């Protein structure tokens, strides 16, 4: 018998086009331009997930360096004396302390120094 | 038991959905199963036996 996939043919592309919502120009309504943009958007989203984990560590390191240079120190020497002291606090918590709790940060610095 | 519980022996039925040239993702797609250009990839090719 004659089988035509007419309803699901468009129901499949509606779902792929609904996530191209907010795109400039015809990248949001035209099918062959939206499909080429949604796949590239998903390709960009697969990566940048490995980069979000190394772009935040850079910010943490910069904030730790800034908070440690206020006490006449450097990030390299501070991290060396912290790692060779049995502390084991990650850079996220260390930067959160350097930003929000300067008293706790300077206490850690004076204890490891 | 009934006409609504028919079940053949395990291993007698197979996929029956395998069609060649149905998009990348089902295996055989694009250059369906004949590789790239050549005489063995043209429509109507037959192997001369002798």
């Amino acid at each position: 018998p004659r089988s035509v996939n007419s309803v699901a043919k468009r129901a499949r592309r509606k779902k792929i086009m609904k996530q191209a919502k907010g795109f400039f120009g015809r990248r949001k309504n035209v099918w062959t331009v939206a499909k080429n943009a949604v796949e590239k958007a998903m390709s960009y989203a697969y990566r940048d997930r490995k980069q979000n984990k190394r772009n935040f560590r850079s910010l943490w390191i910069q904030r730790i360096n800034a908070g440690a240079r206020l006490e006449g120190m450097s990030y390299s020497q501070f991290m060396g004396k912290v790692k060779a002291n049995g502390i084991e606090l990650n850079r996220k918590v260390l930067a959160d302390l350097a930003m929000n709790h300067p008293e706790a940060f300077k206490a850690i610095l004076n204890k490891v120094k | 038991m009934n006409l609504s519980n028919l079940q053949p022996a395990e291993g007698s039925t197979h996929n029956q959905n395998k069609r060649v040239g149905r998009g990348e993702g089902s295996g055989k797609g694009g250059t369906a199963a004949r590789g790239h250009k050549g005489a063995k990839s043209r429509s109507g090719y037959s192997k001369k036996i002798g």
């Binding site: 390709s43 697969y46 049995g86 502390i87 084991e88 706790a104 | 990348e24 993702g25 694009g30």
Partner: protein, 104 residues
């Protein structure tokens, strides 16, 4: 009084009455859990920073629910080769509510 505790594989900013999202724990829903892995405490007047896994410190929590995060689409594709694949992925998580930070 706030402490930092490594619960599953990561450190937090555990407070006295906080709700945390951690990885999937092997504990039934509505049960009590204790973590003796406090790395730093501060009871508003003194920071008792010491070696990891302070002896007497321990954070107690209660398991609220086991849920799953928002689905992320992992899409891989190589141009001009015809290779592509997309898969959905959720993350198993467990919500906990803190109900005490026993010091010493």
């Amino acid at each position: 009084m706030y402490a930092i505790v490594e619960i599953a594989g990561q450190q937090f900013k555990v407070s006295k009455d906080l709700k945390v999202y951690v990885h999937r724990l092997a504990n039934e829903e509505g049960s009590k859990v204790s973590f003796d892995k406090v790395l730093l405490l501060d009871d508003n007047g003194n920071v008792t920073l010491g070696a990891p896994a302070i002896e007497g410190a321990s954070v107690e929590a209660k398991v609220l629910q086991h849920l799953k995060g928002d689905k992320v689409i992992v899409f891989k594709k190589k141009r001009r080769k015809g290779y592509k694949k997309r898969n959905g992925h959720r993350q198993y998580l467990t919500q906990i509510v803190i109900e005490g930070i026993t010091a010493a």
